[PDB]
Amino acid sequence: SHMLRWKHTSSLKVANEPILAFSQGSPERDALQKALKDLKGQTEAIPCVVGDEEVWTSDIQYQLSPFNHAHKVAKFCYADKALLNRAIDAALAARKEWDLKPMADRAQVFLKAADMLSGPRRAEVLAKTMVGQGKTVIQAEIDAAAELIDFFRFNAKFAVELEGEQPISVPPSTNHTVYRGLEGFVAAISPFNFTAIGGNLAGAPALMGNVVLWKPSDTAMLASYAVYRILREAGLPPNIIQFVPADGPTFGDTVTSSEHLCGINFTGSVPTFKHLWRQVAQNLDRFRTFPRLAGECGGKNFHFVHSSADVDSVVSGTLRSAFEYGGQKCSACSRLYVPKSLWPQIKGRLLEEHSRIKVGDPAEDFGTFFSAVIDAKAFARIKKWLEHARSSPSLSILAGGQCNESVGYYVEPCIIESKDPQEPIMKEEIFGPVLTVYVYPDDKYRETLKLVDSTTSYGLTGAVFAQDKAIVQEATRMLRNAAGNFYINDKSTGSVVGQQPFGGARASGTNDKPGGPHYILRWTSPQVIKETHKPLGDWRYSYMQ
Amino acid sequence: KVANEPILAFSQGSPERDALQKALKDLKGQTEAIPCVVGDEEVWTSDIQYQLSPFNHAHKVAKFCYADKALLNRAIDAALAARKEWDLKPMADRAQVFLKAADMLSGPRRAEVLAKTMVGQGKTVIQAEIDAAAELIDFFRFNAKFAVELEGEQPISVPPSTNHTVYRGLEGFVAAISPFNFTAIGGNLAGAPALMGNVVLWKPSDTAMLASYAVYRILREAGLPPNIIQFVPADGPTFGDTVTSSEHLCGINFTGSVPTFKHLWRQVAQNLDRFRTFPRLAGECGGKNFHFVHSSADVDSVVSGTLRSAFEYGGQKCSACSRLYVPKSLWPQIKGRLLEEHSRIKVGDPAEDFGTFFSAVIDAKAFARIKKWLEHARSSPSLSILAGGQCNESVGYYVEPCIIESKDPQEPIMKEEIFGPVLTVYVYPDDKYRETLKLVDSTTSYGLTGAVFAQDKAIVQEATRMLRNAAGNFYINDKSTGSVVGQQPFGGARASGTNDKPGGPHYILRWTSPQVIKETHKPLGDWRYSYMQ
Ligand SMILES: O=C(O)CCCC(=O)O
Numbered sequence A: 001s002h003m004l005r006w007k008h009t010s011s012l013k014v015a016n017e018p019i020l021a022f023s024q025g026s027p028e029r030d031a032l033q034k035a036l037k038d039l040k041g042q043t044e045a046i047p048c049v050v051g052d053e054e055v056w057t058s059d060i061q062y063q064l065s066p067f068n069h070a071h072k073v074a075k076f077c078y079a080d081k082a083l084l085n086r087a088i089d090a091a092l093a094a095r096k097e098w099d100l101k102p103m104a105d106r107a108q109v110f111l112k113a114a115d116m117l118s119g120p121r122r123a124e125v126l127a128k129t130m131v132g133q134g135k136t137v138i139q140a141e142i143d144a145a146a147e148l149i150d151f152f153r154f155n156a157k158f159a160v161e162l163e164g165e166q167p168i169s170v171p172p173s174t175n176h177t178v179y180r181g182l183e184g185f186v187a188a189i190s191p192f193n194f195t196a197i198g199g200n201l202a203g204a205p206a207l208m209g210n211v212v213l214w215k216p217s218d219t220a221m222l223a224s225y226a227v228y229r230i231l232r233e234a235g236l237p238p239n240i241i242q243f244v245p246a247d248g249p250t251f252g253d254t255v256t257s258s259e260h261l262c263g264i265n266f267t268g269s270v271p272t273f274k275h276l277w278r279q280v281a282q283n284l285d286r287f288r289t290f291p292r293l294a295g296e297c298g299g300k301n302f303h304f305v306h307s308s309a310d311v312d313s314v315v316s317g318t319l320r321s322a323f324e325y326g327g328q329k330c331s332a333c334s335r336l337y338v339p340k341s342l343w344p345q346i347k348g349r350l351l352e353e354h355s356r357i358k359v360g361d362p363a364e365d366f367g368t369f370f371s372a373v374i375d376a377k378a379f380a381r382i383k384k385w386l387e388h389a390r391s392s393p394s395l396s397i398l399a400g401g402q403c404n405e406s407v408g409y410y411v412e413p414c415i416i417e418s419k420d421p422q423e424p425i426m427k428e429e430i431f432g433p434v435l436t437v438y439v440y441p442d443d444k445y446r447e448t449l450k451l452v453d454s455t456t457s458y459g460l461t462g463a464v465f466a467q468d469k470a471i472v473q474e475a476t477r478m479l480r481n482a483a484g485n486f487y488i489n490d491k492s493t494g495s496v497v498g499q500q501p502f503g504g505a506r507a508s509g510t511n512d513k514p515g516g517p518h519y520i521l522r523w524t525s526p527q528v529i530k531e532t533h534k535p536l537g538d539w540r541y542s543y544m545q
Numbered sequence B: 001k002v003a004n005e006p007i008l009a010f011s012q013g014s015p016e017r018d019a020l021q022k023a024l025k026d027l028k029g030q031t032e033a034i035p036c037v038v039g040d041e042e043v044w045t046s047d048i049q050y051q052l053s054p055f056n057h058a059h060k061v062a063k064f065c066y067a068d069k070a071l072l073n074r075a076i077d078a079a080l081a082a083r084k085e086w087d088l089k090p091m092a093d094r095a096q097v098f099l100k101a102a103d104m105l106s107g108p109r110r111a112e113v114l115a116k117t118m119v120g121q122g123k124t125v126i127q128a129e130i131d132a133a134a135e136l137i138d139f140f141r142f143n144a145k146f147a148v149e150l151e152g153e154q155p156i157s158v159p160p161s162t163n164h165t166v167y168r169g170l171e172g173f174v175a176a177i178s179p180f181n182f183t184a185i186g187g188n189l190a191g192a193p194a195l196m197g198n199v200v201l202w203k204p205s206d207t208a209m210l211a212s213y214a215v216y217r218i219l220r221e222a223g224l225p226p227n228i229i230q231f232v233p234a235d236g237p238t239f240g241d242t243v244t245s246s247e248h249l250c251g252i253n254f255t256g257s258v259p260t261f262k263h264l265w266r267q268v269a270q271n272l273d274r275f276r277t278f279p280r281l282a283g284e285c286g287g288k289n290f291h292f293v294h295s296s297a298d299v300d301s302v303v304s305g306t307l308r309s310a311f312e313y314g315g316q317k318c319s320a321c322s323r324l325y326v327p328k329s330l331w332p333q334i335k336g337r338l339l340e341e342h343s344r345i346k347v348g349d350p351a352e353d354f355g356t357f358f359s360a361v362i363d364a365k366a367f368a369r370i371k372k373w374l375e376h377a378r379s380s381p382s383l384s385i386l387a388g389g390q391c392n393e394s395v396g397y398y399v400e401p402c403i404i405e406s407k408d409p410q411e412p413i414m415k416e417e418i419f420g421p422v423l424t425v426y427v428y429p430d431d432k433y434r435e436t437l438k439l440v441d442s443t444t445s446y447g448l449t450g451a452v453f454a455q456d457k458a459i460v461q462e463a464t465r466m467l468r469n470a471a472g473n474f475y476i477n478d479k480s481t482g483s484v485v486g487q488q489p490f491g492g493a494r495a496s497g498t499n500d501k502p503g504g505p506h507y508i509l510r511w512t513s514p515q516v517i518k519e520t521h522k523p524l525g526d527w528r529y530s531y532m533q
């Protein structure tokens, strides 16, 4: 008789969250305008949350509205090391019960949270993302609603269905895999540029039975706290995700110094990821187990045009990739490679369309294509690149090039032509609305493809525009490791959960493919149980007779 | 569609026993000169080494050599030049090489790989069979299946776009570093990554060289192209230093000591700025595994299962039982039975005497380490040797099975991995079983295997909960050793490693870095959006 009895596993039907249109007179447009008004002139005081306790430290910080930095949208504080360690202790004390909860019960929290975000909370998270991170309507919509909702629903499906992955049983024994959470706590460290990423970085490990210290991005605090509150309201128990904004170095020092660290789920700069990686290595003898580091780290992404390309698609897809959300995406196109034969046509269209791009206040004017960049630091960096484009003999500014930080961190979309395919601006991630173009002779398309592949340290996203099948096949083979998300006749941004799992290798990170069915596997440490139902025999074997 | 390879019985007059006997005779008095292989080139260096037969160390079963820094760097370059074409091969075509190798190992080469594992690593017939045949064959067949099926894992496509995932090999080379104790593990450490489109420098274990090279040659004969796996025995630190110094390192597939894995981890971290991508480290690092007995246990099963787990292959398994917890009420039975069966265990030459239960330990270094523990057992106030404890390295590295009782559940012998035929027993008061379960969990730094023996359902349920993280491979009424591919994926956390569960369907995921391709079949619209108008 079987002493361990394993319950049958269920399945989950989910689909991508539909993108809304926000047409005039539509309910979502009116709801959004109301949610935007709800934020005008408001400052939210956002505490650290440990368990259910709201905690304040002396390290007071402000989040500013990028397009109106006079507006402090949130006042928050950095957790001190004492509070971080207390958060660790409380999370650890909550972990066993949470890990032992059926996967389906944990998933229900995220499915509930996804419905809330889909419906009654949509306008709120969109508005907080627009005002706090400077996103336009459609950029907030694909992010804080659609992607976050998809993460929560698809990850719940992947997780529930994962328990159906079971080993073979042969008499006289029954074999079962238990998908245990990691023993210890996970540190989640999220970036400013996507509300959805913060929710996934903290949420996915929690779904798999982990407990988490979540350090949200300073410049995305407003929307991040909104998401945190929704998770708790959806039924996430206390001490499963601790909401602990903190000084970055301080946070990293603290979590990497704890013997109970079992994972870091990170999205941000290469240098910071490498630094955490080395801190873990330094402390390796202290940990109860080997921590798992996951990092997504940015790119220098390309659109490559072949002479057979559809010109109109090249222009609109490049404009979107390069300039949406001010080019502040790890996936944004920042290098465009154009054949000489098409350059007159493409150049003309790009400059014409450029003149029609409206940069302004995304809350007050829905005609805005994109708005201010995130903060003074980003503004200063981008300014230095525009200045480099002027001084450099290999570079010439074809359009834009101006910026003004008197009201918001405003930067014109800028199009640069480089005569040098190895110019530093062709190599280094700017994270601003700065597109560099290199024109290559048609008969050197193959040599140029090799340049696309070899010029930068990154491997995140890239697109090929071509109507020639042989060329598409050739280019796809050549560029296999130049992009983890590769596009044929479409723009290099806008990966959708369950359709284009996102991530790339080289300097771009560990490529764990959040948005795909395998991502959750990083956050479980499986145990296999074999129950044998018959007495064992002798210790000897018959051949020994 | 694959199933597990049958374990043969090797009965008198059977085809397999006749074939194995011939294969053993084929190796008697033989020394194979095993070169480094880079591509198809057989390379010798001046750094000559020998592999000795553990039970007869006068027999040099192989002469090989250590690849120097320069040779290793040459092997990296050659492998890297072969990687693109190998990775571009359809998954099915790479799989075919491993399925052919599996069929070879199953049939015409079975006796050879078994004999080489017996003579070279000191395994008995059945230990070689479950290892060099069954487990290796199963790795190759199951990973092939998993990988082929992985290509069927594809994302959602919505018109007018088609999405496809390409399971790329990792860009760079993978270093595979395998242990002496399982022929199959070497085959998997180098084989699994190669299957997924990687190129590999394989540093096989000195003390398993003969069988490892046998596997290497089978892979080549089965159609593995030149420069996909380089066969590069080497000094450990030299190999580690060289591979972690290359900008092209993309993975380390390691099975061996905790401190060495930690060292490699730290070398990678120190050199992080040099690498083209973040290397993936995978490590399986041993355990201090338990058999916990409840008063309701079947004593016969406890005795036979514990004897096998503790002493098979001289206890030289990362999964071997080395701490046994017994309730006072059952101790007189279990002690009496353990001591009686002990006196019947045959230690000797496994080639010449199939009556042998287990043979010599792997080498002089192992013999010395194990003897230090026996000497500790003779010194410690809380330890008493109940049986065994003898050892003699005059002819082979022979260590008798040893049964020790500890009065201290926290004694270093209860905590530290010996990798020898040394079983320590702790007797607990029946009414303190719960406190004792907690001690099972908290005493050691490891989390690999464990067994509970009990016939009471509530006890089994309670124990399972409490030991959830004490064991990655957990057994109810069965021994802690002998995981079978596709049935009990193997590995554990805590200090026991990264727990990537080789033997299961997810292991190959560590050795692929997926790419997603989206093709859009209609021209793109305007860059503007309707809501902006
Ligand atoms: O910037 C990021 O980190 C996410 C980009 C995702 C995408 O555009 O596909």
Ligand SMILES: O=C(O)CCCC(=O)O
Pocket (backbone or CB within 6 Å): B181, B182, B316, B317, B318, B319, B320, B480, B481, B482, B483, B484, B490
């Ligand atoms: O010792 C090892 O490294 C493998 C042990 C596998 C098992 O016995 O389950």
